[PDB]
Amino acid sequence: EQYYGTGRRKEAVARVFLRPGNGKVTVNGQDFNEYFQGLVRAVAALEPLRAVDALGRFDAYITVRGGGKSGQIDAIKLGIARALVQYNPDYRAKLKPLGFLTRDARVVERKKYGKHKARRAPQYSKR
Amino acid sequence: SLKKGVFVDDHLLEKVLELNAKGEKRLIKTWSRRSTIVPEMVGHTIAVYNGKQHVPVYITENMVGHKLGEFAPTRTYR
Amino acid sequence: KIRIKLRGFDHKTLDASAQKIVEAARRSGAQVSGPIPLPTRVRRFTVIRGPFKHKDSREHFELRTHNRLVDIINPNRKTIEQLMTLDLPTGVEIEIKT
Amino acid sequence: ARKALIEKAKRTPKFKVRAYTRCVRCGRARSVYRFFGLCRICLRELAHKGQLPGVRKASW
Amino acid sequence: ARRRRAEVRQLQPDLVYGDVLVTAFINKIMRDGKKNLAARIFYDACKIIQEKTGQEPLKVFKQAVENVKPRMEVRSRRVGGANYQVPMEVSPRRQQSLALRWLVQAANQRPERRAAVRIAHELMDAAEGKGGAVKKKEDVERMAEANRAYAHYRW
Amino acid sequence: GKGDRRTRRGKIWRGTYGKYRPRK
Amino acid sequence: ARIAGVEIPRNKRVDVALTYIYGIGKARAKEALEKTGINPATRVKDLTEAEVVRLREYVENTWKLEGELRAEVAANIKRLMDIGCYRGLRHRRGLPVRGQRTRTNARTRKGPRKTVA
RNA sequence: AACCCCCGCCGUUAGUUGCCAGCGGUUCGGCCGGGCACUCUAACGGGACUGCCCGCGAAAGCGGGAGGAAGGAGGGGACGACGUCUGGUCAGCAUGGCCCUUACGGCCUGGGCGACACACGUGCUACAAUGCCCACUACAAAGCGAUGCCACCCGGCAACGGGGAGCUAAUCGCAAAAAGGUGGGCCCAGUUCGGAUUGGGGUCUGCAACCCGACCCCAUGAAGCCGGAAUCGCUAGUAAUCGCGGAUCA
Ligand SMILES: [Mg+2]
Ligand SMILES: [Mg+2]
Ligand SMILES: [Zn+2]
User: Fold this and answer.
1) On chain B, which terminus has fewer CB atoms closer than 10 Å, C or N?
2) Distance (Å, rounded) from C-alpha E29 to C-alpha E36?
3) Where in the sequence is the domain holding A43, given as residue range(s)?
4) Does E16 touch chain A (CB under 8 A)?
5) G85 touches chain B (CB under 8 A)
6) GO cellular-component terms in the record (chain C)?
7) Mutate which of A36, A40, A72, A102 to test chain E, going by most E C-beta atoms within 10 A?
8) Cα separation of A69 and G30, whole Å?
9) What is the rounded CA–CA span in Å between residue D2 and residue E140?
10) Tally of domains in chain A
11) What is the 3-state secondary structure (H, E, C) of D20-53?
12) Which residues of D touch C44 (CB under 8 A)?
């Protein structure tokens, strides 16, 4: 019945409980268009829905926690992907080449000692 | 700031009380530049130390709310 | 009903003592929730290497203080004697309460 | 004044604002961690030796 | 690097129109890592475009960046111990880079108060054939044909 | 102004609260 | 209108207008409006004649201000001067009262940099 | 190089963290029952080996692609050889020699490392409309706390004080992450930009805040409208930028 998938990025997890229906999307309560306001990445998270050709035909319910505001969006992005692919093996043959199934290894690194920001070193000098 | 009970040393008040108890001189080599000047103590001369020596700084009406250190140099040429 | 705390450093020694209790309590009494690991509180200490001036190449350690929880329900007399005699702790300061 | 000072640090005759921290091992005046009660120097020395329980090499 | 050429950074295509060139422009506008801010600021001008002229902001953007695309430029180079101002064709990427860049600066040059209106008016003059960024382009191309003598060292 | 001794982020940078910054 | 005796903060926010008044600032500006029921948004260019004398006379007679305030500031300094407290001698040479970094900057009171070397 | 630690894909093991994902009740707070699937909490193991397909080659290897969470060391850490610099440190400590011994040792009060006509280094805060103020609203991680972290209530404009619950603490607490987001004021001004300097009054620590602490509220509102010669940082979650914690310690 339902389409589940796990979302995660920058320690921002996001459960994805999808249920075929209309288009009403709830995430941690509230509404999708309600929670994300004035952000273009919002409609970008629904990209997997536009790839499958079924924008308005599914009621979503995501539980995203931790991480930043945007990290949640990327979490929902990959989360929705695993949800729709869970009940669709052929949709992986067109969601994968488009690049979706990846935790995005890109993550902040440790601020190294002696330095200031893991890389930026204090102004070199000799005077 | 010490708003609850103005700060000051006991031997300061003690030594200065006998000075008012009969109206003696004023000579008094102190070592507590941290204390606050007592009001009725006007007209006396506290020899305040400052690492170097005892400064014969006089006293009056205006100089009261301030410390004893306020009127005693701790550095040369100042 | 009863709850046991198993604080300690080395998780290798903590795993042996924790698993030991699990076998002893279950194999000789009612139900017992397995070893429940908690967020390990760590004391990260950073510091300089050289004695004099060297605000770089500094070295730092960390104090691993592990935590493991185990809950026994029905107070069995067999489990009380088992844990009272058959025990092999060491660097594992345990604390138990009702 | 090194010896007489390490003794004065444990004295605490007058007010508490003189019972400053003082390393036990090599008796350092500063860089004294309260937890270990040692200085940063003698701290690392022991750590390498393994005389510091639970104190493993930090790496992440 | 001395070894590899280092491949370009394939950026994410536009999230509203569907075009990488647009998003790249947002990045140039992006101050202190505020994409969503710069994005809106860009789309603000897009609406200002339709306010003035009934033209789509999409092609209005292409026309501008196209007319500010430097065809050639002079580059310094040593020869035995002397620098020659040798002109020659630019790389398509760099042309796109400079174009998008100059426009952003040309907007800053304007007296306009709000950033959007600055980007708005600038995109108009750019698409037209005469603007702050455009003239800076015309300037560079002059240097090329000017030093055309030293163009013998094409390298 | 991260330096204004009388603003929002004014006390925030100074790790304090006071009047202009809400406090319990 | 000539509010504080001579000062005339015309054509602008009423609250800000009082900020230009010596001895009056952002805080004391809001206080006058909350004690006379004046909207901070409205300009001085369009106010009632009653409100003029109203707000003007209020702040005027209420607390100290203007040069007479500035006279008190120097007055206390005459007191730190007549004897010479550590605070006063700093005003003598122009040094800061906080005993800050004189070995470096502190140009705010020491004036421009007199290189000379 | 490779074995060990952190972050990435997944599983096994343990379910008082979280969970109407499933159902019912519900003062609708996962609160009750209930459940371990999920998230997570750590613990063990798996996976990536130019392994597979195609081109080049004698080989090693290189190049393009599929599978895959991740390809040609995946990102990061720890690891810094023989030697080098008469490099640093007798003031961490050890230590040969040297020198003093009613003082080159020891205790105390006060002063002093904070002294300023000047110059250099590393920094912080700005010069503002991609911006500044007010009100309202939302998403972190990591770490720390029983004579310590203080929920929350009363008071004061305020720092903060009086009362007082929880907490040897994934269960209580510092705690509001900030930037962002919504609506509003500002209209280019030495400015609601900028916050140095200075006057008056207050709170906390501490025997004790003149020298010489910190933070409040009122006023004061200086230079600077992006900086000469020259010069520094970093190739991706990096630069820039915006926050929180910890050691230290009254
Ligand atoms: Mg798992
Ligand atoms: Mg006043
Ligand atoms: Zn020591």
Assistant:
1) N
2) 11
3) 1-127
4) yes
5) yes
6) ribonucleoprotein complex; ribosome
7) A40
8) 38
9) 73
10) 1
11) CCCCCCCCCCCCECCCCCCEHHHHHHHHHHCCCC
12) 58
Span from the CA of A42 to the centroid of ligand 2 (angstroms): 53
Determine A/B contact with 3+ CB pairs under 8 A as the test. Answer: no
Give the chain B residue whose CA is nearest to the CA of G90.
B78
CATH classification of the domain holding A89 = 3.30.230.10
- The neighbouring-strand residues paired with E87 are E74
In chain B, what are the domains?
Answer: 1-78 (3.30.860.10)
**Data resolution in angstroms:** 3.6
* Experimental determination approach used: X-ray
User: B70 CB near a chain G CB, below 8 Å?
Assistant: yes
Is B63 in contact with G83 (Cβ distance < 8 A)? Answer: yes
**Which tokens belong to E55?**
């033209």
Of 4.10.830.10, 3.40.1170.60, 3.30.499.10, 3.40.50.2300, the CATH number of D1-60 is 4.10.830.10
Q: Which nucleotides of H are covered by protein (CB under 7 A)?
A: 4-10, 13-17, 19, 21-22, 38-44, 66-70, 74-80, 88-89, 92-93, 105-126, 129-136, 138-144, 151-153, 157-160, 168-171, 177-182, 185-188, 192-200, 202-222, 232-250
Burial of E87 (0-12, 13-18, 19+ CB in 10 A): buried
Distance from CA of C96 to the nearest CA of D (A): 23
Residue with minimal CA–C1' distance to H19 is A63
Torsion of CA G59, G64, G66, G69, to 10 degrees: -170
Tell me whether A38 touches chain C (CB under 8 Å).
no
Contact G83 B62 (CB under 8 A): yes
Nearest Cα neighbor of D29 from D41, D16, D14 is D41
Could B62 and G82 be called an inter-chain contact, meaning their C-beta atoms sit closer than 8 Å?
A: yes
Q: Contact F11/F17 with Cβ under 8 angstroms?
A: yes
**Whole-angstrom distance, CA of residue E39 vs CA of residue A34:** 19
Rounded CA gap, B38 and E43, in Å?
73
* Kind of pairing between the strands at B45-48 and B27-30: parallel
Domains recognised in chain E with CATH numbers: 1-155 (1.10.455.10)
Single out the residue of G8, G14, G46 nearest to residue G32, CA to CA: G14
Gyration radius of chain C over CA positions? 19
Tell me the shortest Cα–Cα distance from C52 to chain D, in angstroms. 10
Q: Which of G82, G85, G89 sits opposite B66 (nearest CB)?
A: G85
Q: Which ligand is nearest to the CA of A6?
A: 1
Spacing, Cα C12 to ligand 2 middle (Å): 68
Q: Which of A74, A60, A70, A5 is nearest to A29 (CA)?
A: A60
User: Three-state DSSP class for E127?
Assistant: helix
Domains and CATH numbers, chain C: 1-98 (3.30.70.600)
